[PDB]
Design a protein around this ligand. Structure first.
Ligand SMILES: N#CCC1=N[C@H]2CCCC[C@H]2N1
Lengths: 38, 154
């Protein structure tokens, strides 16, 4: 039995930690909702 | 049922385990299908029943139709409002990459978090939810990249 609990407001935070790269990838999406690399 | 970000928990396994995250907006709860598998949810003493879902999109809404319609502009940095298991909600700013598919391009965020972080919202600079994090792929270098998954508002 699953339940939900509030974790916060949805807001943009000024000066949040900035990380991650921006990869451009060729992908395929199957009928089961799984993404894969082409 | 106040608007905001929520953890999705279960007591079926050892202790209390966070299986995902979701967004309450306009009285509707939004998460990824793989988090709940379409099961009903509890909110305090009340029950939330599924209303719409699609395995291929990997999305599900409760109490009403999908309400989130904002889209990534294809240029600006966004924020993942990550809600990791047993940890406080935290904003992470990033410039999305792209998933190129035979049916069009989708934004993608290259950030890695525990599986139970699935359903955390990705936001634009106006605080609008442009999609949910948690359905993606493992690339060559072993890095995880999530699609920015957004539903359709009928
Ligand atoms: N939500 C989320 C992110 C995530 N989900 C797992 C899927 C397989 C790769 C390792 C994990 N990273």
């Amino acid at each position: 039995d699953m339940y939900i609990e509030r974790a916060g407001d949805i807001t943009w935070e000024k000066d949040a930690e900035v990380t991650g790269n921006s990869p451009r990838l060729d992908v395929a999406l199957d009928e089961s909702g799984d993404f894969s690399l082409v | 049922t106040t608007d905001g970000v929520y953890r999705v928990m279960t007591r079926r396994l050892l202790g209390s385990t966070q299986v995902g995250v979701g967004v309450m907006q306009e009285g509707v709860f939004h998460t990824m299908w793989h988090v709940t598998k379409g099961a009903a949810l509890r909110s305090g003493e009340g029950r939330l029943d599924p209303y719409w879902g699609d395995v291929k999109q990997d999305l599900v809404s409760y109490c009403g139709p999908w309400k989130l319609d904002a889209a990534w502009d294809g240029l600006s940095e966004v924020q993942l409002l990550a809600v990791p298991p047993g940890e406080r909600a935290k904003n992470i700013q990033t410039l999305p990459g792209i998933f190129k598919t035979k049916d069009g391009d989708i934004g993608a965020v290259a950030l890695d978090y525990p599986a139970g972080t699935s359903g955390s919202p990705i936001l634009d600079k106006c605080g609008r939810v442009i999609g949910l994090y948690g359905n993606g792929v493992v690339i060559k270098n072993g890095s995880y990249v999530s699609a920015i998954t957004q539903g359709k508002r009928e």
